[PDB]
Amino acid sequence: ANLAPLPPHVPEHLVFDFDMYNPSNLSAGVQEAWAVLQESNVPDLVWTRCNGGHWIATRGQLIREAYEDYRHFSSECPFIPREAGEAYDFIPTSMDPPEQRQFRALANQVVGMPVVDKLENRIQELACSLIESLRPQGQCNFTEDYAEPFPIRIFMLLAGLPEEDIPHLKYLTDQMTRPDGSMTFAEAKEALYDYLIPIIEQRRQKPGTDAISIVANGQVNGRPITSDEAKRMCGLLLVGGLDTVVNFLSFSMEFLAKSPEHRQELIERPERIPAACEELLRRFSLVADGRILTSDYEFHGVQLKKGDQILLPQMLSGLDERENAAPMHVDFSRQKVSHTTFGHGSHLCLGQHLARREIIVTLKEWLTRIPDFSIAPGAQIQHKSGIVSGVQALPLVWDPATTKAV
Numbered sequence: 284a285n286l287a288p289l290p291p292h293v294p295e296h297l298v299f300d301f302d303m304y305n306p307s308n309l310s311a312g313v314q315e316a317w318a319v320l321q322e323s324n325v326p327d328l329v330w331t332r333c334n335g336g337h338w339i340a341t342r343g344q345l346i347r348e349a350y351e352d353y354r355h356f357s358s359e360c361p362f363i364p365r366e367a368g369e370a371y372d373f374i375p376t377s378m379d380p381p382e383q384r385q386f387r388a389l390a391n392q393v394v395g396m397p398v399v400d401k402l403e404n405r406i407q408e409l410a411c412s413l414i415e416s417l418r419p420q421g422q423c424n425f426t427e428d429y430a431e432p433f434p435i436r437i438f439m440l441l442a443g444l445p446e447e448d449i450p451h452l453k454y455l456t457d458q459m460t461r462p463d464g465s466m467t468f469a470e471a472k473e474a475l476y477d478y479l480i481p482i483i484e485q486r487r488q489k490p491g492t493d494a495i496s497i498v499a500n501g502q503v504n505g506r507p508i509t510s511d512e513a514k515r516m517c518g519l520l521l522v523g524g525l526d527t528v529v530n531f532l533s534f535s536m537e538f539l540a541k542s543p544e545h546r547q548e549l550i551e552r553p554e555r556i557p558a559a560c561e562e563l564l565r566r567f568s569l570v571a572d573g574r575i576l577t578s579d580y581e582f583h584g585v586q587l588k589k590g591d592q593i594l595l596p597q598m599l600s601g602l603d604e605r606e607n608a609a610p611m612h613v614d615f616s617r618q619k620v621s622h623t624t625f626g627h628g629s630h631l632c633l634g635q636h637l638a639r640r641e642i643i644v645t646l647k648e649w650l651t652r653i654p655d656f657s658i659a660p661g662a663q664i665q666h667k668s669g670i671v672s673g674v675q676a677l678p679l680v681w682d683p684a685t686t687k688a689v
């Protein structure tokens with residue numbers, strides 16, 4: 284079963300053995316599988332003995348509160364189990380303010396709204412190229428053919444890196460979250476650093492207007508950013524916008540493929556696309572990381588112990604029936620779409636603006652060229668669960684005669 288012995292300070296009545304890496308009824312959909320944590324018989328805050336043992340906040344109120352309170356809930360160990368969150372070094376994911384603030388401001392210079400607005404049409408040009416290449420085929424595995432190539436190519440654009448480096452960079456990042464065995468996490472991480480360091484050092488001396496140049500020439504605490512800090516920052520800027528976007532776009536397209544009326548709504552009402560993007564972000568939320576207790580702390584009537592890890596599923600806030608009525612229903616016209624899909628608090632996703640642009644551009648450009656599409660006949664879509672939950676594959680089909688080259 285792989286259950287760790289219940290710590291003495293944890294009450295038995297709060298035990299609920301949820302496995303974030305293999306939840307029951309995953310076949311019903313990953314968001315639905317996690318939603319079991321919100322059924323009436325489950326407390327607001329529970330302890331699971333799976334994956335080493337850890338707390339799980341199941342309601343939006345608690346999830347938000349914990350993310351706001353970095354003093355008690357530290358990012359030093361954000362992953363479960365502990366012997367993975369202690370190893371990882373990317374900046375500034377494992378830092379708490381004030382330390383985190385300096386690096387966060389610098390990162391915002393490369394992915395902030397001003398930059399996203401400026402690269403807006405370049406992202407569109409990339410989406411159109413990928414979609415046009417698939418259009419005549421009448422079929423594709425959305426995840427492999429569009430979802431994966433899109434974000435990585437956008438990173439190359441952002442970081443001013445050559446297209447020829449994509450296959451290798453993609454492989455290195457793939458090994459960090461989906462290893463085939465050729466490389467350990469440390470080896471993949473170091474391989475990434477071996478690639479980034481030379482570029483960082485060269486652009487420190489002869490800078491451009493790209494993301495790496497900006498980070499390399501950044502300042503931290505009155506002095507210049509070190510090579511170690513720069514590579515760790517660039518590393519997160521790379522990995523942060525890959526799996527999240529790949530899987531999110533896949534969840535969204537899976538829904539649209541199965542929902543003809545929703546596709547038509549966006550075709551007839553293009554102005555609703557941004558709102559649709561927000562509603563999809565709520566319904567198909569997919570991240571679930573955590574924090575570690577800095578000291579003994581009583582939280583909502585529960586005794587938390589220093590060193591205890593707590594999973595705070597960003598995914599769950601928007602699915603909470605206390606926040607949004609009929610949470611499993613996708614309604615593009617909701618007046619108030621509440622969610623913490625991009626996180627909450629000091630670590631709120633720095634790439635949130637880039638992500639929304641990628642989503643909106645994908646939706647508009649795909650529906651413009653391929654308005655009518657469906658899940659391939661006989662195909663059964665499978666999901667996966669973890670820190671970033673997702674879709675294994677998404678075989679889509681369409682009649683080329685119903686499409687149009689634009």
Ligand code: DRB
Pocket residue numbers: 304334362363364366367368371373376458459460461462468522523524527570572669670671
């Ligand atoms: C290669 C790899 C990774 C890996 C992880 C990684 C993490 C995650 C921590 C390290 C991952 C780091 C991600 C880096 C990228 C990144 O930072 N993205 C960012 C970005 C996007 C979101 C949001 C924020 C911005 C923060 C972050 C996430 C957590 C657990 N394990 Ru699992 N694991 C971990 C350590 C030691 C052994 C081990 C095993 C052993 C056997 C079988 C499984 N595992 N493992 C794998 C699949 C399913 C279950 C599973 C378990 C289950 C229980 C116990 C161990 N293992 N494992 C294995 C290989």
Ligand code: HEM
Pocket residue numbers: 358361374375376377383387390394519520521523524525527528531569570572573597624625626627629630631632633634635637638
């Ligand atoms: C749909 C897509 C995305 C989702 C759902 C998502 C979600 C998240 C979440 C939940 C966090 C905070 C985690 C925590 O509090 O520990 C986060 C952090 C971050 N994300 Fe994203 N993200 C997305 C896209 C992107 C993109 C496109 C980039 C581009 C580089 C990116 C860069 C980052 C960075 C650098 C951080 C760290 C912020 C900090 O620690 O201060 N993300 N993201």
